[PDB]
Write a protein that binds this DNA or RNA. Structure first.
Ligand SMILES: [K+]
Ligand SMILES: [K+]
Ligand SMILES: [Mg+2]
Ligand SMILES: [Mg+2]
Ligand SMILES: [Mg+2]
Ligand SMILES: [Mg+2]
Ligand SMILES: [Mg+2]
Ligand SMILES: [Mg+2]
Ligand SMILES: [Mg+2]
Ligand SMILES: [Mg+2]
Ligand SMILES: [Mg+2]
Ligand SMILES: [Mg+2]
Ligand SMILES: [Mg+2]
Ligand SMILES: [Zn+2]
Ligand SMILES: [Zn+2]
Lengths: 120, 178, 46, 48, 135
RNA sequence: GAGUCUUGGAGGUAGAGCACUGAUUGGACUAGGGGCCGGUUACCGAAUUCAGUCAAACUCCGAAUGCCAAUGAC
RNA sequence: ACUGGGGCGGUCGCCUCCUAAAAGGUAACGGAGGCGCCCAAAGGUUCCCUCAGAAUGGUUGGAAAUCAUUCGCAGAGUGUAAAGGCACAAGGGAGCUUGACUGCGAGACCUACAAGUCGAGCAGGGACGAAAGUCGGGCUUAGUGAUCCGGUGGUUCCGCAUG
RNA sequence: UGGUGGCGAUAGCGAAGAGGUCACACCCGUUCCCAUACCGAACACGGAAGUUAAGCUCUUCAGCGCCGAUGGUAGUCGGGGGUUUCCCCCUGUGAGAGUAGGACGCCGCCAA
RNA sequence: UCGGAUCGCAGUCUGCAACUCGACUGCGUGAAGCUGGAAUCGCUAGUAAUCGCGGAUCAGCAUGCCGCGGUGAAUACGUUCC
RNA sequence: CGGGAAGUAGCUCAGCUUGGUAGAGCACAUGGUUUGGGACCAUGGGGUCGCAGGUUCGAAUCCUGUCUUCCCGACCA
RNA sequence: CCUCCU
């Protein structure tokens, strides 16, 4: 037999390690990413209150992208969370990479979010 | 290769029926094949590893990693961090390509071969077989070998039990002792 | 497969003198065996 | 294991002291360290 | 002669002997037993004397449990030395026995025999004791 | 400043306990060793297990007090 | 010099534990141990990770080398004594580095003095990181010695009429 | 359902079931970014043939672990007494163990 | 491709009978041994060395013993020492 | 009583200070030599380091305890 | 160097 470890369980340990040194305030909230097999999701969160402020996923109908999985989708999602952030009056954030390697789709979201407005 | 195609088309449907699983996801497969050469004479002879690597390199087809000593041991004159072995992990095509050659070609060339044992399952459906001569593998030339030396070949599987693992390996050409 | 560090590994074709033929992957371009699963007696039965 | 002085390679000021093992580090050790005179990071080297 | 096979520290504080016994206040293995009414150190020499006295009277019939074990070391200085210049050397072994502690238990003999065997042992010990039964 | 009441807190003693370390008793149980023929025994036995003792330099626990404060009141 | 008279023996500074009576402190020629260093990574940072041991299988190969699976709050590790800590690791691995920085420092702890300890934060110029940020040696607590005198390097200082 | 938090395991282990269009997974590839002291296992990039088997989600359970009174007892501040290695009395205080009992999750925010 | 011990298997012959305990044969096996430390022996010529052959005893059993021929050396200064 | 020093093959001694290798002499054994001994020559074998515990991957070696045998000291009264 | 007793 070979009992395999859950990729997500491994990720959550990595994410806990990020979140030891990193957290959102109302003044400077936490742009968290979650990256599924099919989709990618961004929430902007403050942890003192424990409340999402803005969000954007590939499940949003505003996106007219073909592949929800790929990096191009992540760029669209990164713009959209940054746009919705600017409506709520959010400039400065901390990027919570969510346990994922700062690379690929997750980096694509982060880079798009910067260009669109958000300061990190 | 033929064994991977044989597995998906023939073996996996048979095992589904045999054991009467709910899902096809329950059907046991071969996860990996770890080939280990313990080289304790690396303590004495420095070149023992360099040779043992080169053999394992051609047998497997990947560069092996050189395993090192977890502890110092006085009985063996082993110090911690000494190279005393070499493993290589085989998955996917390189696994099936190897396992095909093992069964089809190499195990026939074993001197006085009378099957591999039915005893050698770990109790959780992983099989290990001890090779004595590296000359059995067709990549190894007879003339180039100086030091004779064998290896362990672990076949890891997603079989929970031995009888499920046994079946899978029997459904592959593996010559179990009659 | 990180490039450079491994040996060259490619199509092979093994051939029993006894007659069996099939193509594994290996280092050698033409493998020629004098025994295989179909010739050897444990497998066949004597 | 011995006391060493690292002199700034630019101005020559003996800015730092440190220790090293002579057995482990027999050659003159070099480090990039802040020179207060030059007001920047310069290469400093163990004094001969 | 009972003593521990090894000890962590060869020289220990004497400590104090307030309070009733923490445990071992009921006959638990045997049928009968002898219970301490007073606190004392019991030396391993006294345990052997008591053991023999009761065992001989039982004729090595039945079964004796020794519920105390002399684990605590005690030191003594050589004869005639002055005070100080470090603690004395290890001398013997004691069990600390508080009121209520069942010291020995007996099985496999009559109550009449048990009583007499334990009476004989009591006279070897430096404490007052009472004969006790299990419940 | 002090006393007392009230409130909060740090801390591992007394006691107690066996969760760790060490010591230790009996039963069941045997790996192994020793007498005795690869074979058997009242000879000892590691682990495991059930029950039971103990500890300044053991603690799964844990006071009374003392201590540091805050808050008014007397 | 200490000294349950002195001599003789032993000790003399520093660190850890117990004695020590649940803050802190607390003696004895009371009970136990360490230190007078080591490491150019065994330091900094970024990223990734999980240990002892056992069972079972397996060439040489054993009680025990390397391989595989399973169980596994840690029964390991943490340069080194011990204690307190440490598995979002303070333990293990890899990449890049030299913050094992210069000027300091609100405020604290400790304290007869002399010393000793902690420190956010500011500036300069950096390391690592996408960023957030972390970094003024090491999981923490030993690894050290006043003054005088002398040596060496630097120096918008003084220079016995003036240079 | 999925994401993301807070709360001492009353949240955990273990056991027995149930579920999947979407969502979450496993899953299928290695051309490309990136990757393995060897290995596309993992990480990474891409895919959707298959599957709820596992993770995940939801039921049930008190075997283990966890939480846990009341009463009593030990100890003890203060005040007395004695037969003073220790013990007793009185106004307070009051464990640990043991037990009755609780408990197989409670509370947010976002998206669908 | 030296050497042919040891052992397995299958035989042959003698003999009432080859287990203890015969010789020989076939097939398989293929040990030690790379010219031997201190020391020590024989031989002066058809000798030594080497190669076969025969015989007595004897059912069978000789690397021993007693004979037989084939090929066929080296060296002896000398008498000090053993 | 206090302080030292030893403890290694049958006997006498090195090795310990610097952790990884058990040595040496005599004796012992076998052969040779001799009529036979002795001497001589050649060729071997022999402990697991007093005992126990500890540190270490590993102890004759470093640490502790214990046992045995020695040595020194025990003064002012 | 030695060579048991009768
Ligand atoms: K006195
Ligand atoms: K590093
Ligand atoms: Mg107590
Ligand atoms: Mg004096
Ligand atoms: Mg004196
Ligand atoms: Mg003196
Ligand atoms: Mg106190
Ligand atoms: Mg205190
Ligand atoms: Mg002076
Ligand atoms: Mg002048
Ligand atoms: Mg309670
Ligand atoms: Mg003549
Ligand atoms: Mg004849
Ligand atoms: Zn064939
Ligand atoms: Zn400079």
């Amino acid at each position: 037999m070979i009992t395999k470890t859950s990729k997500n369980a491994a990720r959550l340990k990595r994410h806990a390690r990020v979140r030891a040194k990193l957290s959102g305030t109302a003044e400077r909230p936490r742009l968290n990413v979650f990256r599924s097999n099919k989709h990618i999701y961004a929430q902007i969160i403050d942890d003192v209150n424990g409340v999402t402020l803005a969000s954007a996923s590939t499940l949003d109908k505003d996106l007219n992208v073909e592949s929800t999985g790929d990096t191009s989708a992540a760029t669209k999602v990164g713009e959209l969370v940054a746009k919705r952030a600017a409506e709520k009056g959010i400039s400065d954030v901390v990027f919570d990479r969510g346990g994922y390697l700062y690379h690929g789709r997750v980096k694509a979201l982060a880079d798009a979010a910067r260009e669109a407005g958000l300061k990190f | 290769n033929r064994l991977k195609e044989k597995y998906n088309k023939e073996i996996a449907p048979a095992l589904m029926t045999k054991f009467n699983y709910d899902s096809v996801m329950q059907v046991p497969k071969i996860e990996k094949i770890v080939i280990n050469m313990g080289v304790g004479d690396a303590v004495q002879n420095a070149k023992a590893i360099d040779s043992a690597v080169e053999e394992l390199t051609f047998i497997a087809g990947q560069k092996p990693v050189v395993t090192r000593a977890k502890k110092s041991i006085a009985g063996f004159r082993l110090r911690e961090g000494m190279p005393i072995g070499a493993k290589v992990t085989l998955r996917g095509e390189r696994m099936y390509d190897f396992l095909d050659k093992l069964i089809s070609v190499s195990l026939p060339r074993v001197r006085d071969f009378r099957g591999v044992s039915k005893k050698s399952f770990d109790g959780r459906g992983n099989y290990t077989l001890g090779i004595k001569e590296q000359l059995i593998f067709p990549e190894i030339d007879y003339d180039k070998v100086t030091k004779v030396r064998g290896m362990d070949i672990v076949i890891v599987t997603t079989a929970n039990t031995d009888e499920e693992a046994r079946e899978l390996l029997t459904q592959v050409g593996m010559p179990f002792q009659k | 497969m990180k490039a450079g560090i491994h040996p060259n590994f490619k199509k092979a074709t093994v051939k029993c003198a006894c007659g069996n033929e099939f193509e594994t992957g290996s280092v050698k371009e033409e493998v020629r065996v004098e025994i295989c699963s179909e010739c050897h007696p444990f497998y066949t039965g004597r | 294991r011995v006391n060493i002085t690292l002199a700034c390679t630019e101005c020559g000021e003996r800015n730092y002291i440190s220790k090293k093992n002579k057995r482990n580090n027999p050659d003159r050790v070099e480090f990039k360290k802040y020179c207060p005179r030059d007001k920047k990071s310069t290469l400093h080297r163990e004094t001969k | 002669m009972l003593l521990p096979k090894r000890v962590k520290y060869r020289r220990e504080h004497r400590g104090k002997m307030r309070g009733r016994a923490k445990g071992g206040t009921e006959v638990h293995f045997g049928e009968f037993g002898i219970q301490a009414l007073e606190a004392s150190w019991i030396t391993n020499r006294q345990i052997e004397a008591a053991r023999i006295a009761m065992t001989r009277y039982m004729k090595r019939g039945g079964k004796v449990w020794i519920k105390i074990f002399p684990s605590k070391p005690y030191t003594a200085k050589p004869l005639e030395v002055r005070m100080g210049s470090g603690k004395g050397a290890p001398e013997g072994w004691v069990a600390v026995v508080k009121p209520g502690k069942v010291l020995f238990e007996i099985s496999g003999v009559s109550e009449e025999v048990a009583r007499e065997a334990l009476r004989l042992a009591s006279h070897k010990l430096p404490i007052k004791t009472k004969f006790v039964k299990r419940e």
